[PDB]
Amino acid sequence: MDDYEKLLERAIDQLPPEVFETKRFEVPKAYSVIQGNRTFIQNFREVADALNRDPQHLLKFLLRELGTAGNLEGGRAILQGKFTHFLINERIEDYVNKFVICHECNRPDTRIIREGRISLLKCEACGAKAPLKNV
Ligand SMILES: [Zn+2]
């Protein structure tokens, strides 16, 4: 149930949200490669989703840390800056591997909150989680 996922491709790509279902975007291996001073992204599609469901954000982040030119090299997505599988792997591993890291946040007997469509939340109980703003 982890590796050999049961992806039916039901409205998880071009198929409009006509069919009701839960979109489980999680697949092993989701990190870039450190090459001198550039990141050779190969799964920009999968790596991007997990690292950030929204492509607009993920992209704004690579440039925000990319101190170099910043562009797509090769044929996949070899950017250049500071996105050396740093923030990428961290965020992705947070969601894809939220079970072993979040300690199976099933029915926590605490006050949990999630905002941004499974993007942000708090887990002061089973560790710590980022809600959104600091009041
Ligand atoms: Zn938790």
From Swiss-Prot:
Q: Highest taxon of the source?
A: Archaea
GO MF annotation, one: translation initiation factor activity
SMART domains associated with the record? eIF2B_5 (SM00653)
Please name every pair of cysteines joined by a disulfide bond in this record: none
One short Pfam family name for this protein?
eIF-5_eIF-2B
UniProt entry keywords in alphabetical sequence: Initiation factor, Protein biosynthesis
Q: Tell me the SUPFAM superfamilies matching this sequence.
A: Translation initiation factor 2 beta, aIF2beta, N-terminal domain (SSF100966), Zinc-binding domain of translation initiation factor 2 beta (SSF75689)
What is this protein's function per UniProt?
A: eIF-2 functions in the early steps of protein synthesis by forming a ternary complex with GTP and initiator tRNA.
* Subunit structure as annotated in this protein's UniProt entry: Heterotrimer composed of an alpha, a beta and a gamma chain.
Q: Which family does it belong to?
A: Belongs to the eIF-2-beta/eIF-5 family.
| Protein name (record) | Translation initiation factor 2 subunit beta
The gene name reads: eif2b
